């Protein structure tokens, strides 16, 4: 199937005292495999998936070195943005960064990303072609001029198309027993009488991987969105995901309603009835 590698970075300034809080997390698809927390004791890039532990001391020293360089860059960045925005030293601010690559079913480069947000809002992003920038405002435009003159996009493109894809491919191999396995949702239906005229049917999807899923309700073979509730896909905590879709129905008419489940681990979509 298709795969992605993603790194998420959050830096939060702490004006009263000391350097910002810095958290970095690495993912292959929906699986977290590495972490760095500036508040943790080790001060090392740490494994969070057993298949990354196969990597030796060279890997860990290299990743630790780069993650600390990433941290100091974000520290300088928070100071630079406060100046660009003419903000005081009194308030706490957040810089967020995400970068990575998508690969198709051929495991070859499909897409690349390198973007930032300042205080929860879009700052600067590398465009899909990996050649130009989306600068949200005049502060982000100052970054865009600096990076254009320094040919930053060319350097990012080379990592995103080359390096990123090569390491994702390696991770996929080392973690093949879990990373290349799809866990189809375990589905069931529950019924709850609310009054003697109304009932709730709840269609559950559990223990599935990847997180991506579609649950739809049908009434007499026709799509129904009215009188339906669909919770956000949520982590189970064991690496799998959960989701439910409920429909409010007239008591005694339960049979008209069917739940439809689409997932990567399912060759053909599955149907559930009460």
């Amino acid at each position: 199937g298709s795969h992605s590698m993603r790194y998420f970075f959050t830096s939060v300034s702490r004006p009263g005292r000391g350097e910002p809080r810095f958290i970095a997390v690495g993912y292959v698809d929906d699986t977290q495999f590495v972490r760095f927390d500036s508040d943790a004791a080790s001060q090392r890039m740490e494994p969070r998936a057993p298949w990354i532990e196969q990597e030796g001391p060279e890997y860990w020293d290299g990743e630790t070195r780069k993650v600390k360089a990433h941290s100091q860059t974000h520290r300088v960045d928070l100071g630079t943005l406060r100046g660009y925005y003419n903000q005081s030293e009194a308030g706490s601010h957040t810089v967020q960064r995400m970068y990575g690559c998508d690969v198709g079913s051929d495991w070859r480069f499909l897409r690349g990303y390198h973007q930032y947000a300042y205080d929860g809002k879009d700052y600067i992003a590398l465009k899909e072609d990996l050649r130009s920038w989306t600068a949200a405002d005049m502060a982000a435009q100052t970054t865009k001029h600096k990076w254009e003159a320094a040919h930053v996009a060319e350097q990012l493109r080379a990592y995103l198309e080359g390096t990123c894809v090569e390491w994702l491919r390696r991770y996929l191999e080392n973690g093949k027993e879990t990373l290349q396995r799809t866990d189809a949702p375990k589905t069931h239906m529950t019924h709850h009488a609310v009054s003697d005229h109304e009932a709730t049917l709840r269609c559950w999807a559990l223990s599935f991987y990847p997180a991506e899923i579609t649950l739809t309700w049908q009434r007499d073979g026709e799509d129904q969105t009215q009188d339906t509730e669909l919770v956000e896909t949520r982590p189970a905590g064991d690496g799998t995901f959960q989701k439910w879709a409920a429909v409010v129905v007239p008591s005694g008419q339960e049979q008209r309603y069917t739940c439809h489940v689409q997932h990567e681990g399912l060759p053909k979509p599955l149907t559930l009835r009460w």
């Binding site: 860059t73 630079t80 320094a150 350097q155 990592y159």
Partner: peptide, 9 residues
């Protein structure tokens, strides 16, 4: 595998 280079805003 993290990017070896970083670029300042």
């Amino acid at each position: 595998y993290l990017q070896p280079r970083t670029f300042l805003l």
